[PDB]
């Protein structure tokens, strides 16, 4: 009934290591008692706990030209429209109205799709590098 008991159980089960017990108790405080906790190796001498909130998935860019924050080489928008496609966006006609909405409302657009082919990529990169449209695929 207490997180101190959680820390005590994790400390006893880790051969009396109170740092492992404390870090498991902190992870279980943050993501919940029935949450997801994954162990992996570290490149640093000390153990560390990283909390990933929201919906983070391991898919990067499609075009490197979409970077609008050169400090971390990343794409950064706030209050952005999201266009989700179950199929790979291929035709130009399938991407022109979404860009028209995103430009008429003056709001960024994140296009999450199965893939984006060369024509739609060329339209997106041209509208980013020529007129300055806030888009990312």
């Amino acid at each position: 009934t207490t997180p101190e008991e959680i820390a005590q159980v994790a400390t006893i089960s880790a051969n009396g290591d109170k740092e492992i017990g404390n870090i498991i108790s902190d992870a279980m405080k943050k993501v919940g008692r029935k949450g997801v906790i994954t162990v992996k190796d570290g490149k640093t001498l000390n153990d560390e706990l990283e909390i990933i909130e929201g919906m983070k998935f391991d898919r990067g860019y499609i075009s490197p030209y979409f970077i609008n924050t050169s400090k971390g080489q990343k794409c950064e928008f706030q209050d952005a429209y999201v266009l989700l496609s179950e199929k790979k966006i291929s035709s130009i006609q399938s991407i022109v109205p979404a860009l028209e909405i995103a430009n008429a409302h003056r709001k960024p657009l994140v296009i999450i799709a199965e893939d984006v082919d060369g024509e739609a990529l060329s339209t997106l990169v041209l509208n980013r590098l020529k007129v300055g449209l806030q888009v990312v695929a």
């Binding site: 130009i92 022109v96 860009l99 028209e100 430009n103 008429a104 024509e119 060329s122 339209t123 041209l126 509208n127 020529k130 007129v131 449209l133």
Partner: protein
């Protein structure tokens, strides 16, 4: 037959200039030039004297110079006049003229 830039096509042959390909949509989205295809809207800049399908008189070309017309996909010949592109079609190959 009408001659355009020292060029007069023979028989029922119509020389047209294709309209400029679109690059910016109505909402402000710029379009890539490579995915624009060929423009099917043209304007007639030269006409021939026509053909002899009926014996005796000569048949004038249905279109005239200064008419906007709709082109088919295939059937044109590229003519380079003063390093500018024009397209030669037949009189019967023209689909229809925009009237106003």
């Amino acid at each position: 037959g009408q001659a355009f830039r020292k060029f007069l096509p023979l028989f029922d042959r119509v020389l047209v200039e294709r309209s400029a390909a679109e690059t910016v949509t109505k909402g402000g989205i710029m379009l890539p030039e490579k995915s624009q295809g060929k423009v099917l809207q043209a304007t007639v800049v030269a006409v021939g004297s026509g053909s002899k399908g009926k014996g005796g008189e000569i048949q004038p070309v249905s279109v005239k110079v200064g008419d906007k017309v709709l082109l088919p996909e295939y059937g044109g010949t590229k003519v380079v006049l003063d390093d500018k592109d024009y397209f030669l079609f037949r009189d019967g190959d023209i689909l229809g003229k925009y009237v106003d």
